[model samples]
Target: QHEWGELVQLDPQTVGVIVRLERETFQVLNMYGKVVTVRHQAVTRKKDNRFAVALDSEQNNIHVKDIVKVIDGPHSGREGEIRHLFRSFAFLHCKKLVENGGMFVCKTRHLVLAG
Candidate 1:
């Protein structure tokens, strides 16, 4: 029901499934890699799958001391270790080389696995 690049909630009803509707056709890919096609009016655009921000209750893969780098923020290109995490944000313990330096807390979307 959302367009490309638009953030949508990963509710239990739609967990791990990508729905794409292209050229008047509806396609749904399930977790098992099974694909189904049908005709539908609720067109879901085809887009590359990317991580969407998760709620605090969702399990997070990143853990403390894991190295990561900023990919989309003022701290881009700097490396650091995760010192703490919150719902959709994390505290990165960075070196002085990074802008403003020290422990920086930012959205998880801005970070990428570095180590």
Candidate 2:
């Protein structure tokens, strides 16, 4: 099972995504509606930390209590335990990112991971 965050709100300063897909590789679209290519080699061969959120640079520490809410998804919203601590990727709550840097608000829904 996988956890995914649903974008409920967004920061205008943040760029928008034109397209998102996961195939033989993972692809993300820029806010300008341009398709930026990220090589699978750039990611696939990296050390497997099991992290759901991966940035090219270091992450600034933010309070874990600040997380809005977790929800379940069929592309709806994120539902589950929300945490602020960084841990190994296997942590179920650290599964999905609120993608494209959106400011997500919590919705009343969720699902449980069986495995």
CA lDDT of every candidate: 0.46, 0.29
- TM-score of candidate 1 relative to the true fold: 0.41
Best by TM-score: 1
Give per-residue CA lDDT, model 1, range 1-115, as digits (tens): 3331121223333312223545655454332223454443332333322242233232345654467677656656777776545445655665673322254555566676754
Report lDDT (Cα) of residue 47, candidate 1: 33
Q: Cα lDDT of model 1 overall? A: 0.46
Residue-wise C-alpha lDDT for candidate 2, range 1-115, written one tens digit per residue: 1112211111233221212445553443332323354434432221222244422122322232333233433443544343312222111232354444232222222322222
At residue 69, what lDDT does model 1 achieve?
Answer: 74
Root-mean-square deviation per candidate: 13.8, 12.2
